Amino acid sequence: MSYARPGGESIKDTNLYVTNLPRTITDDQLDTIFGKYGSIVQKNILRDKLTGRPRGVAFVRYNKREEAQEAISALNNVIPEGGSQPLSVRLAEEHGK
Numbered sequence: 001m002s003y004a005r006p007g008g009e010s011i012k013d014t015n016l017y018v019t020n021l022p023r024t025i026t027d028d029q030l031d032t033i034f035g036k037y038g039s040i041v042q043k044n045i046l047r048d049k050l051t052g053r054p055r056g057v058a059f060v061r062y063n064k065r066e067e068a069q070e071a072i073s074a075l076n077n078v079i080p081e082g083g084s085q086p087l088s089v090r091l092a093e094e095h096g097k
Contacts, residue, residue, distance in 0.1 A: 006068035014068040018087030021058040037070035
């Protein structure tokens with residue numbers, strides 16, 4: 001059915017769309033939660049209350065396909081067990097760092 005998504009390759013373009021992510025943290029904060037796999041070439045947040053385009057979801061960075069895999073586990077739920085709403089990690093089908 002589906003065996004992992006992102007693959008592997010020097011910093012190219014493999015960011016992942018994190019779904020379900022309230023603004024309880026800061027964009028620069030998601031960096032501290034990572035600081036272990038890659039150097040996250042980005043980190044943003046997208047809301048859908050005045051455009052109707054997205055669906056309450058942020059966008060984590062993971063250029064190197066391999067690094068994106070990290071976000072899969074490492075970023076999956078980028079909050080210490082205690083709510084904070086986790087993010088659904090997965091390489092989106094758009095490619096754009």
